Amino acid sequence: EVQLVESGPGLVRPSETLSLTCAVSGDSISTNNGWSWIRQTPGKGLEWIGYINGRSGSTRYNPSLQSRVTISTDTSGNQFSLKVNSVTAADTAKYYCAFFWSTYYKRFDVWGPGVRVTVS
Amino acid sequence: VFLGFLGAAGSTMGAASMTLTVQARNLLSGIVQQQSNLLRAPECQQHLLKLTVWGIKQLQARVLAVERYLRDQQLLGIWGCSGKLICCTNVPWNSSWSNRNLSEIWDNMTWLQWDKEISNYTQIIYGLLEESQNQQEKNEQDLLAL
Amino acid sequence: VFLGFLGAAGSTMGAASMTLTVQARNLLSGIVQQQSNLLRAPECQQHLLKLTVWGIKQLQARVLAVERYLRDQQLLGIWGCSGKLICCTNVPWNSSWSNRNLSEIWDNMTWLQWDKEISNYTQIIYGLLEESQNQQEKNEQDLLAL
Amino acid sequence: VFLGFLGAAGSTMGAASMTLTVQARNLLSGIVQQQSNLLRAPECQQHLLKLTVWGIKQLQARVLAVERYLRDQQLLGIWGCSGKLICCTNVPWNSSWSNRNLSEIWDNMTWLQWDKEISNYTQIIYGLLEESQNQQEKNEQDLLAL
Amino acid sequence: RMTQSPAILSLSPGERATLSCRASQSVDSRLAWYQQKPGQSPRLLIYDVSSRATGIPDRFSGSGSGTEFTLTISSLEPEDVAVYFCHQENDWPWTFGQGTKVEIK
Amino acid sequence: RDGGSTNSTTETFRPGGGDMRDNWRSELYKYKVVKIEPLGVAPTRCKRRVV
Ligand SMILES: *[C@@H]1O[C@H](CO)[C@@H](O[C@@H]2O[C@H](CO)[C@@H](O)[C@H](O)[C@H]2NC(C)=O)[C@H](O)[C@H]1NC(C)=O
Ligand SMILES: *[C@@H]1O[C@H](CO)[C@@H](O[C@@H]2O[C@H](CO)[C@@H](O)[C@H](O)[C@H]2NC(C)=O)[C@H](O)[C@H]1NC(C)=O
Ligand SMILES: *[C@@H]1O[C@H](CO)[C@@H](O[C@@H]2O[C@H](CO)[C@@H](O)[C@H](O)[C@H]2NC(C)=O)[C@H](O)[C@H]1NC(C)=O
Ligand SMILES: *[C@@H]1O[C@H](CO[C@@H]2O[C@@H](C)[C@@H](O)[C@@H](O)[C@@H]2O)[C@@H](O)[C@H](O)[C@H]1NC(C)=O
Ligand SMILES: *[C@@H]1O[C@H](CO[C@@H]2O[C@@H](C)[C@@H](O)[C@@H](O)[C@@H]2O)[C@@H](O)[C@H](O)[C@H]1NC(C)=O
Ligand SMILES: *[C@@H]1O[C@H](CO[C@@H]2O[C@@H](C)[C@@H](O)[C@@H](O)[C@@H]2O)[C@@H](O)[C@H](O)[C@H]1NC(C)=O
Ligand SMILES: *[C@@H]1O[C@H](CO)[C@@H](O)[C@H](O)[C@H]1NC(C)=O
Ligand SMILES: *[C@@H]1O[C@H](CO)[C@@H](O)[C@H](O)[C@H]1NC(C)=O
Ligand SMILES: *[C@@H]1O[C@H](CO)[C@@H](O)[C@H](O)[C@H]1NC(C)=O
Ligand SMILES: *[C@@H]1O[C@H](CO)[C@@H](O)[C@H](O)[C@H]1NC(C)=O
């Protein structure tokens, strides 16, 4: 059982990079692969941004942001973060931190409350 | 069959890697294993029954060829190489086991020379190959993969 | 080899699934199967020839270990699992054979307990696995696939 | 097991290709290979020890079934078909070996008839299948592929 | 890559509610459903088409395969007013359907 | 033992005889032989992916 807490600027201007972080309490992020970011955009619905494997540092990103998003970890702070470059008004959305466990034996999610970010 | 059975023995490792089916085909098929599979009775058989000691020696030879074959196949299976004469793994080379570059060993050494150079690291390498496959299966049982 | 041969026997199914090579390695290699493969003659051998009854008992033990091994490998091949210690199939679980959730069996039961719970459904399951593979091959022989 | 062992023998090649597991399952499991694997002792065994000639005849039969099985598996492995009952290769049909169209052989001939038509081309075909696999491995050891 | 229908249902308490979801490509059996109440992050209800997530009421069930899937809520309660989402788990893009609402009157 | 005796409640023990097997039972009592059966099946969430 973990708790996910997001934090970051609620406002980013055109062409700026948006930086959001998520703290993880109750377990480690150096392991437990499947730390991810999800975006909820009014008028579009839910989409994935991508995720990171705490054990290796590898990442996968949804193709729409293949050239725009970076996901990385601070295993000392036991927090992870999302950075999206060249942010525009179209990126206004509710951003969430989530943990997805999907193995042969178990399936579950943990979601944080998220951060609403306005983009000018 | 047996038309160049150890023909590559004095050749380099690189060239010898191209004849691997030649030796593989001769591990399960000696003369007695061909006579035993004739459509006609082999005729000889009565000798090996009348005199049971000879019957036992022949069976021991046949059973052993099978056991040796199966043990090598089991290791290849455990290491993640079911079939294939040449397979790649994820275990890095230590450069302690042998410290030579690729252009030296594939072109200048024979397999016999190589075998006499790293023979006391054989068990270490085999142990690592097994651990590598176990780690791979642990990663396969994760639907988010890599 | 044999450093924790049934060590996971009292552990849960989940944990025990991580030691599968440990038991697999001991199916074809008893002490006599190691002595039989020495570079030197084993010396003992004359005893088993002078007294043919002992020679026969030893061979029967060796032949049986091989036959049992091969039969398990044949079933895995038929079911579509050539190699692999863990393989997924397309046969759904009936929930009659056993009616427990994943969080109950993988974490609370040992493999011995599981085996004693579904032992009389073994043949049904094996039959379904074979039918599934045959259906898959029928679908493979269709170039429009799925 | 053995519920239609050669049932497709008089059927066409096409229909018979759908029963391949039926014959495969009966190559390693005769009656004596089932009795030998009982949890209880078979009881009979003392007879085969008291009279060693009968003990030897039984072992020869069991060893041979294993050797024949393994040789067929080795060929499939060499040709690049580890497992599978049906596998495709890269060797073209010569139209000398047999000169019939697909609609004639798959629908009108039985496998016995086919076997009696191309039996003296068997070794040529097997030789080509081995060469094809060796060529494929040579191409695999090229990281630019095709 | 998946579309839900209808945009909204309006049901009497105790009535059975059904929502469909159609894929553009086969998603095999890898389908999950989520419940998002206003002010909340989505909760997992169902995974692998019909398996209930731990802690989910037996009101919730579902079925389907390939491209045709349904979420069903029997004996619908006022506490089930939410936006329900269809989630693809058979490919890399992991898309979601747009979300539909069920409201109890 | 001989069997019961009298109302005084006694038991009489004597050196016994019996089959030679009782000599081996005194050492092998701790051991059992079992056959190992490596195949088994169980429910999981995976499905063979057909490719
Ligand atoms: C035995 O050793 C000789 C000498 O190293 C090998 O000769 C080479 O043969 C190839 C193929 O004809 C030539 O391209 C090389 O130039 C030869 N080497 C030299 C130094 O002239 C010979 O091939 C070896 N035998 C085997 C079976 O490999
Ligand atoms: C034998 O049973 C005990 C009790 O269930 C197992 O103890 C667990 O060990 C793990 C690893 O150290 C701990 O994380 C668990 O919390 C322990 N369980 C309890 C209830 O305390 C023990 O592992 C079992 N033996 C084997 C070989 O699996
Ligand atoms: C033995 O030969 C007969 C005659 O060719 C086969 O009969 C066919 O059976 C199928 C399936 O019922 C029908 O669709 C065909 O129309 C029949 N053929 C004719 C000419 O009528 C029979 O199937 C063969 N036996 C086996 C085991 O294959
Ligand atoms: C690489 O080698 C390191 C040094 O190991 C030492 O030398 C080898 C040949 C053995 O004799 C070993 O017992 C000695 O401690 C290892 O620490 C390291 O793990 C090796 N890497 C791999 C992949 O094996
Ligand atoms: C699921 O189970 C249905 C009921 O089958 C009955 O119970 C089983 C345990 C056997 O004893 C069987 O002979 C009984 O008729 C089956 O009708 C159905 O086919 C099963 N599904 C699968 C995949 O096997
Ligand atoms: C196709 O056939 C050509 C003719 O070969 C002749 O007939 C066969 C049946 C044999 O008896 C052979 O010894 C004869 O020379 C071959 O030249 C050609 O290589 C064949 N193609 C393939 C793939 O085998
Ligand atoms: C290990 O192998 C090397 C091969 O060069 C040999 O020189 C060395 O003596 C061997 N070690 C032992 C203990 O035999
Ligand atoms: C079938 O297995 C179950 C295991 O729970 C057992 O209770 C039942 O008696 C078995 N059936 C027969 C006919 O032995
Ligand atoms: C080769 O097989 C054909 C089959 O039609 C047969 O007629 C021919 O006589 C055979 N050749 C030899 C030398 O036996
Ligand atoms: C599995 O069944 C047990 C016993 O009924 C129950 O306590 C447990 O919560 C169930 N697991 C799930 C995920 O519902």
Pairing of strands E8-11, E100-104: parallel
Evaluate the CA torsion angle A23, A27, A32, A34 in order and state its sign: negative
Q: Whose atoms come closest to the Cα of C125: which ligand?
A: 5
**E50, C93 Cβ separation under 8 angstroms:** no
Those residues whose C-beta lies under 8 Å from the C-beta of residue B25, and which sit 6 or more positions away, are B1, D74, D78
Contacts of D51 (CB under 8 A, 6+ apart): none
CA torsion angle for D59, D60, D63, D65 (degrees, to 10)?
Answer: -120
Q: Please give the structure tokens belonging to residue C34.
A: 């190691």
Cβ contact C44:C38 at 8 Å: no
Atom of ligand 8 nearest to the CA of C116: 4
Q: From CA B109, how far away is CA E100, in angstroms rounded?
A: 70
Q: Specify whether the CB–CB gap between C14 and A104 falls below 8 A.
A: no
DSSP-based three-state secondary structure for A100: strand
What is the dihedral sign for C-alpha B103, B106, B112, B118? positive
Question: Buried b / exposed e across D21-46, counting CB within 10 Å, b at 16+?
Answer: bbbebeebbeeebeebeeeeeeeebe
Tell me the C-alpha distance between E27 and A53, whole Å.
24
Given its phi and psi angles, is residue B74 left (phi above 0), alpha (psi -120 to 50 degrees) or beta? alpha
In angstroms, the CA D94 to CA B137 distance is: 43
Nearest C-alpha to atom 17 of ligand 4 is from which residue? B94
Tell me which chain B residues have a C-beta less than 8 angstroms from the C-beta of F46.
Answer: 141, 143
Given phi > 0 = left and psi -120 to 50 = alpha, else beta, which region is D2? left
Neighbours of D129 (CB within 10 A): 18
Ligand nearest to the CA of D96: 6
What are the backbone dihedrals phi and psi of residue C25, each rounded to the nearest 5 degrees, phi first?
-70, -15
Kindly report the nearest CA distance between residue D101 and chain B, in angstroms. Answer: 32
> Ligand 4 site: residues with CB under 6 angstroms?
B 92, 94, 96, 128
- Please list every residue in chain D whose beta carbon sits closer than 8 Å to the beta carbon of residue C140: 86
Strands E68-73 and E51-52, sheet pairing: unpaired
Report the distance separating Cα A57 and Cα A68, nearest Å.
18
Closest listed residue to residue B125, CA positions, set B146, B96, B84, B83:
B96
Among E2, E35, E41, most A C-beta atoms within 10 A, so best to mutate, is: E41
Are the beta carbons of D64 and B18 separated by less than 8 Å? no
Q: How far apart are CA D27 and CA B57, in angstroms?
A: 26
**Both structure tokens of A91:** 């990126």
User: Structural domain tally of chain B?
Assistant: 1
Q: For residue D44, give both structure tokens.
A: 């009979």
- How far apart are alpha carbons B23 and A18 in whole angstroms? 63
Residues with Cβ within 8 Å of C13's Cβ and at least 6 positions away in sequence, in order, are C105, C106, C109, C110, C111, C114, F42
Distance (Å, whole) CA E95 – CA E88: 5
Looking at the CA of residue C15, tell me the nearest atom of ligand 2: 28
- Distance between CA atoms of residues A8 and A22, nearest Å: 9
Q: Whose CA is nearest to atom 21 of ligand 6?
A: D94
CA–CA separation, B118 vs B122, rounded Å?
Answer: 7
CA dist C28 and C66 (Å) reads 7
Whether residue A46 and residue E96 make contact (CB cut-off 8 A), yes or no, is: yes
Structure tokens at A28: 């480690």
* Contact (CB, 8 A) for A58 and A70: no
Buried b (16+ CB within 10 A) or exposed e, F5-40: eeeeeeeeeeeeeeeeeeeeeeeeeeeeeeeeeeee
How many angstroms is the resolution? 3.3
Bridge partners (DSSP) of residue A23 are: A5, A79
Mention every residue, 6+ apart, whose C-beta is less than 8 A from residue D62: C63, C67, D32, D33, D36
Report residue E33 as tokens. 């459903």
CATH number where A88 lies: 2.60.40.10
DSSP character at residue A57:
-
For D137, half-sphere exposure in the C-beta direction (CA atoms, 13 angstrom radius) is: 20
Distance, in angstroms, between C36 CA and closest chain A CA?
A: 42
3-state secondary structure chain B: CCCCCCCCCCCCHHHHHHHHHHHHCCCCCCCHHHHCCCCCCCCCHHHHHHCHHHHHHHHHHHHHHHHHHHHHHHHHHHCCCCCCCCCCCCCCCCCCCCCCCHHHHHHHCCHHHHHCCCHHHHHHHHHHHHHHHHHHHHHHCCCCCC
Q: In degrees to the nearest 10, what's the CA dihedral of E2, E8, E13, E18? A: -30
Is the bond into E6 cis (omega within 30 degrees of 0)? Answer: yes
Ligand 1 site-directed mutation target among B5, B11, B19, B107, most atoms within 8 Å of CB: B11
Cβ neighbours of residue C12 under 8 Å, at least 6 residues apart? C106, C107, C108, C109, C110
CA-only gyration radius of chain F, Å: 27
DSSP code string of D100-125: --HHHHHHH--HHHHHTTSGGGHHHH
Residue C86: closest CA among D19, D62, B15, B77: B77
Identify whether the C-beta of residue A117 lies closer than 8 Å to the C-beta of residue A92.
yes
**Cα dist. C139→A37, C145, D105, F50 in Å?**
39, 7, 21, 10
Full domain range(s) for residue B118: 4-146
Closest atom of ligand 7 to CA, residue B119: 2
Q: Are strands A45-52 and A59-61 parallel, antiparallel or unpaired?
A: antiparallel
Strands (E), D11-132: none
Distant-in-sequence, close-in-space partners of C2: CB < 8 Å, separation ≥ 6: C26
The alpha-helical segments, DSSP class H, found in C12-121 are 13-16, 20-24, 32-35, 45-50, 52-78, 102-108, 111-115
**What residues have CB less than 8 Å from C140, skipping those under 6 apart?**
D86
- The number of residues in chain A equals 120
The DSSP secondary-structure symbol of E96 reads B
Q: Ligand 6, from D94, D122, D135: best to mutate by most atoms within 8 Å of Cβ?
A: D94
Asked if A117 contacts A6 with a C-beta cutoff of 8 angstroms, the reply is no
CB C76 within 8 Å of CB C129: no
Cα R_g (chain D), whole angstroms: 21
Cβ contact D44:C48 at 8 Å? no
Residue C135 has a CB neighbour count (10 Å cut-off) of 11
How far is the C-alpha of C6 from the C-alpha of B132, rounded, in Å? Answer: 21
Is the CB of residue D32 less than 8 Å from the CB of residue D57?
no
The verdict on a CB contact (< 8 Å) between A114 and E41 is yes
Q: How far apart are CA D65 and CA D86, in angstroms?
A: 22
C-alpha neighbours within 13 Å on the C-beta side of residue C40: 3
DSSP string, A24-49: EESS-SSSSS-EEEEEEETTTEEEEE
Report the distance separating Cα B25 and Cα B4, nearest Å.
11
Cβ-in-10-Å burial (0-12, 13-18, 19+) of C51 comes to exposed
Substitution target from C54, C59, C68, C74 for chain D, most D beta carbons within 10 A: C74
Interface of F with A (CB under 8 A): 44-46
- Beta-carbon contacts of E28 under 8 Å, excluding residues fewer than 6 positions away, are E65, E66, E90, F47, F49
What distance in angstroms lies between residue C94's CA and the mean position of ligand 5's atoms? 7
CA C21 / ligand 2 centre spacing (Å): 22
Which of these, D46, D71, A43, C75, lies nearest to B37 by C-alpha position?
D71
Report the 10 Å Cβ neighbour count for E4: 22
The tally of CA atoms less than 13 A away on the side-chain side of residue A20 is 31
Interface residue D9 vs chain C (CB under 8 A): no
Which tokens go with B32?
A: 């007695």
Task: Name the amino acid, one letter, at B71.
Answer: R
Beta bridge partners of A70: A83
Domain extent for A10: 3-119
Chains C and F touch (3+ CB pairs under 8 A): yes
Using DSSP bridges, classify how beta strands A115-119 and A11-12 pair: parallel, antiparallel or unpaired.
parallel
Residue with tokens 């290769």: D89
Structure tokens at E53: 């997530």
Question: Are the beta carbons of B117 and B98 closer than 8 angstroms?
Answer: yes
Residue of D37, A106, C37, C26 whose CA lies nearest to B69? C37
